[model samples]
Every structure is written in structure tokens, then in C-alpha cells.
Target chain A: APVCGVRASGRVCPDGYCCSQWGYCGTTEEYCGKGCQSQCDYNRCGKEFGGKECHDELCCSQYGWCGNSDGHCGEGCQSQCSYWRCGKDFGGRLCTEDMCCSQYGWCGLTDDHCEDGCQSQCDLPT
Target chain B: APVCGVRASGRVCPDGYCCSQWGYCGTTEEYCGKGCQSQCDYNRCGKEFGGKECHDELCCSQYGWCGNSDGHCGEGCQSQCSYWRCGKDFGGRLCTEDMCCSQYGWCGLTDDHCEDGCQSQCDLPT
Candidate 1:
């Protein structure tokens, strides 16, 4: 009923999600059928970002990127990153500027890569 | 008798080796027996390389080092490396720049890492 949404700002659908009939948006086939069904946004129509949905404990950057290892948490990171500890975070995904990316994708500015070899990618200085 | 040089290079010993009495070099007690053994030139006292004994099929780099992965076979490589393709050369040992190193320690270019995760330590362009 409300899943099909009322007029103007009417009663929204359920499933912890609002229902639509104009462009097609619903849970099963109730709100989204031949009379509707346009697009389906897990977040209810919008960019996939943090605070809504993601792969896992991974953070949702403001830009809608899934990662908090480095840039995902800094600057344009929307000042955020990670919803949990997420993964092991190897290679130091953040230590750039002459920094050596750790095996975990993190960054470190030293010769820490003495054993298995250092990753030389993310350490981008600029 | 001739390991030092018989007739300016005389009767040479065996194990297919020569006996040098001054340079801390010899084969065993019979040839490198003190008073005559100062050095144990496993390769007749000159330098260990493609023609002498080493750690298994691993080639003895001209520098006496045991490796054939990268520089071990090139430049000043004296044009040498490995005795039996010793071990698997990982991370492309030779791939550089944009070349992703593999898990076993080899290099390759592509998104192959989409699975187990690509090693970002190799593929240098220079």
C-alpha cells in the first residue's frame, strides 16, 4: 500500500525501504511491476556511500568509494573511512610521499619491505 | 705438484682440481693439508662461477653470490646466472613498471590480482 507511495510526499513503502511506482522501485513485485520498475537503489536511490551499504566492514568514503585504507579516510575522504577494522590493511595503504606501500596496500616511508619485498605503488608523493 | 702450475703447471690433482699451496686454497686434507693449505679455492682459487660447486643447481654468480633472478644474470653478470633455473623466479623478477609481481614472486601485467590480490612490489619501468 504505502510501498507504492502516496501522492506528493505520501505514505512510503516498507521493508525499511520506501516504495515507488513511477520509475519502478520496491522490495518484491508489489511496488515494482510493469506499472513501475525504473531503477533499484539499495540505498533507496542515491550514490552508494558510507552509513548505508557496502562490501563489509569496509568504510564508505563520501565519494561512494569502499575503503578507508588511505585517501578514503582523509581529505576528500569526506573526513571518514571504514565502518570497522575491516581487513588486515597490508602494504600501508596511506603512507605516500616517498613512502613505500606495504604488502597490505598501506603506505610506509621506510625500508620495511626487507623481507617479502616492498610494494612501490600507493606511496605516490604528490 | 702442478695445481700451482706443472712445468710452469705440472701434474695437477683431481676431483678435477688443482693444488695451490700458498693461497689458503686446496681440495681436502691431501691437497689443502696445512703447511700447504691456506685458502680453500673450491674452484682452484680464482673465483667461484659457472664452472664450480655451489648450493645445488643454483648458479654461482661471478660475484660468488648464489642467485639468477634479476641482476644475477645481467650487467656485470659476466653473462651468467643459475645452474638449473634454480627455483621459480617470482614477481617477474624481471617485470617492472606497471607489471604486477605475482604471489610466488614473479611479474605480470594485468588485473590478475582481482582474485588472490596482486603483489604491488615489482614491474619497474626503469
Candidate 2:
């Protein structure tokens, strides 16, 4: 529910949301579609090659990388990311109740991903 | 141009094509959708828990793996594969003009995926 950009808090949107070109957080075509900045559905975006399109309510950058930052949401930004984020660098977004966010910002369910420097929502049994 | 399954040649499609439930190579919705088996778009499929849907003309197995094998295209098969095949095991399919298929039946552009035991369409420069 906060703004995300260079001049603003720079805080990324919560999970499943996109950072609008206007630096706001929401899940509308205006916020997740064209002109959208970061928080795409996945880390791969772009219209060609093996690049994928942003899904849900996320943005796709021009360079083909996905995220919610000036570099990812700025000029030439494509559709948006195909997935959400996690970890301190990615707005500290949390994974599903039973999921884990690895240090790399991707969500997964394996020990290699949930153990060690995992970022958020680690559900590994103690 | 050939059938792919338990009894037939099992020779996967050329590339970017799917093996239909009827055991044929084509790019139509019928060949790449519903009853399609094996040669899914990617190696991961299923409708839940981070599982991806088969794209292009591949099939999604009940167990969430993507491929055209009986294990993947038989009863309980979900969508089709999202990608084509490569390597001796995966129908001996080929990769893009410049891509390489790793021993694991996946395609990529890195040395780890292009060198040693690579299956088909290995485009590594000599």
C-alpha cells in the first residue's frame, strides 16, 4: 500500500502486486500491465527468445530482467516480472504459508532453498 | 513426422512440436493441448504448488513432470509439455539453431549445458 521508486520509499509491493510506473503499488492493468515497473509474476520477461510474459498483476522490464527497481521498471521496461519477490533486497516479501524464499529471491520448497540464508516464510520443520 | 510412444519409434518431434495423445507430431491445439503427451513446453508441469503448465505442444504428467513419455502422457496427464525435446532419451530432438540440449534433456546456452554428453543440436563452437 506504499509507493515504490527512487524518490519514494523504494519499498517493493507486497507479494502478487506490481510496482506501477507512477511508483504506486496495486494489481490493476494500469499498475501490473503496460507501463508497470516491477514485481512481475516471474524473474524472466521479454517478448522474444525464451523470455516469458508477466502474469497475475506484475510488470516486465525492457532488459528482460524482472524486479521492482529503477533499472527494472524504468524506461524500456517490458511487461514486468512473472513472480513476486522475497528477501530484504526484494522488499522483504514473504512466501506462501508453506513456502520459502531463497536468498536469490525465488520461492521454492526444497532444503537447498529453505535452508541457510533463506529470506522469508521458511516452513522447514525444526 | 513420426509417432512417439511406448511401441512406436518414440522418436520425439523435431522441436517446438508436441506429441498428441493420438501419437502424432503437429502444432495444432489438438496436438499441443488436452490429450497431448510428452514434449511439454518445459520439464515442470501440474496445476498446483508452483507447478507450471505445459506450453507449445508438450504434455503435463499427473506427477507434475513434463514429457511425452507414457508416464507423462498416460491417464491423469494434465496439459502438454511447454517445450520440445532433445538428446537420445528425449526422442533425439534438436535445439534451436544456436542452442544446446544438456544431458538432462533440458536446453540452454551455457557450457554446463552444451558440453559433454550433450544430446542434440549442440551448437557449441569448435
Candidate 3:
């Protein structure tokens, strides 16, 4: 018997899987793809925020960690800029200004320089 | 004495650091933040597309790999949707539709379900 957890929506699973948002069982592989509410296995998809696994390249725009670890779906500034949970939510598209601070506790873009700020900074060409 | 490389703009650095865009030396930590054209060490910054390091939380909008390995700056769909390079250009903001295919050879968002296409697919709630 594998232990499972409840989803943000309060769904649960006993054998099949637990939905991260729905918290239910019998989660289809597609429905349970990425950014779901359940967990197919331990740390499979519904365990962490960006645990969902998708085939098409998702965007940090919606979710945060739907793609590879190269800072794709949602990892750094995009994670903070798009969602409200930093790395808790992975699988979506777009990074809103409001969502940046509210979710990740910091801003994504740099105004002046990288002299000060949160964990990481960005200084590229204009 | 150490070896260095040229930047997109054709700049070079002998000791300090190379400016990824300007192709010059005296590149301050601010300029060499997260997205630059030179290399600090071997894989410090300039070697790969997303090498520059910064302190602030840059967005995938500007640079892709500016944050943690959680898929921030640029990695997955956002990398494809935003810039022309799939993972080559690690730093920047916003994912344009045109740039997506031109660089990574795929799309980010999922209009329908995840059944086919590129290396991966996205399947989540609407």
C-alpha cells in the first residue's frame, strides 16, 4: 500500500494516484500529465509544485517547472514573476508582474543593476 | 594567465570577464550579472548561452538560466516560445510565438491535449 497526500483542492488517492489540485483517484495519464492535483508515484507528479510531467514544452508563463531543469517551465525569476509559490507551482504559461512578487517573493526583471535584490539577478544587453 | 572567448558582439577578455553583448573587457559584476557574452571561469558564464550570474531575480523574460534549476530564466516551453534558441539563449524575457519555433523547434502553451508533437507535451487543467 503506497501512501498518498491530498491536493490543493483536497483530493486523495489510494492506489491509482493523487491529484495535486483535485485530490482524487483514477487520474488519467493525460489529466494527470503536468500541473495536476494528484501523484502517480512518490515524487512522480503531484508531490512537488513543479512535479507534473508533460510532453509538449509547457511555459513558466502558466506553470513553473513543466520543462527541463534549464530554467524552463518555472525555476528562477519566471517562477517568482509568474506564480505566487515560487517553485511550488510548476506547469503553466506567462509571468505576471503582480504574480511575480506575490508568489515568489521577488521581482523578475532588473530595473537598474544587480547591485542588490533577491537570490539571483539579471544583467544582459539592451 | 587563462584562456577566454569572444562574445556575440565579438568582444574579448583576458583576465577580468567578457561582456556577452558588448564584446569588451572591464565587465563589472553588474554588467556580467546573469546574461553576458564572456566567461568568468570555464563554465562560469560565457561558455554556454546561459552562463552569466547575477544577484537579483532575473526573469526568463530576459535570461533563461538566471535562477535555480527549477526552470526559471529559460529552459522549456518558455525558452522555445520566447527566444529563437531552445536552450541556447538562457537569458531574456517574454516568449514570442515566432521566436518559439525559430529557435527551439516547438511551442510552449497547449491549446488542446498532450498526445503528440516535439520531445514533450503538456496536459493539465484549463
iRMS values for every prediction: 28.3, 20.1, 11.6
Best by DockQ: 3
Model 3's alpha-carbon lDDT is 0.34
lDDT of 2 by residue, A18-73 (tens): 77666766643335544567764334568752667655444565545444422344
Give the Cα lDDT of each candidate.
0.35, 0.56, 0.34
**Can you list each candidate's DockQ?**
0.01, 0.02, 0.06
Q: Tell me the tens digit of each residue's lDDT in model 1 across B1-126.
A: 123533334444444432434221234332332234323344221154334543323334345433332223323333234221111353224332344554434334434321244455433333
Cα deviation in Å at residue B89, candidate 3?
A: 41
- Residue A75, model 1: lDDT of 34
Predicted candidate 3 versus true structure: per-residue lDDT over A43-99, tens digit per residue: 223224454443333233333334332233332423322232232244533334322
Q: How many pairs of residues in model 3 come into backbone collision?
A: 66
TM-score of 2: 0.25
User: How many collisions per candidate?
Assistant: 43, 37, 66
Which ten residues in a row are the worst by lDDT in model 1 chain B?
B78-87
Candidate 1 lDDT, A1-126, residue by residue in tens: 123444435544444432445422333222332233333232221153324643333444444433433223433333224221111353233332345544434334433321234455433344
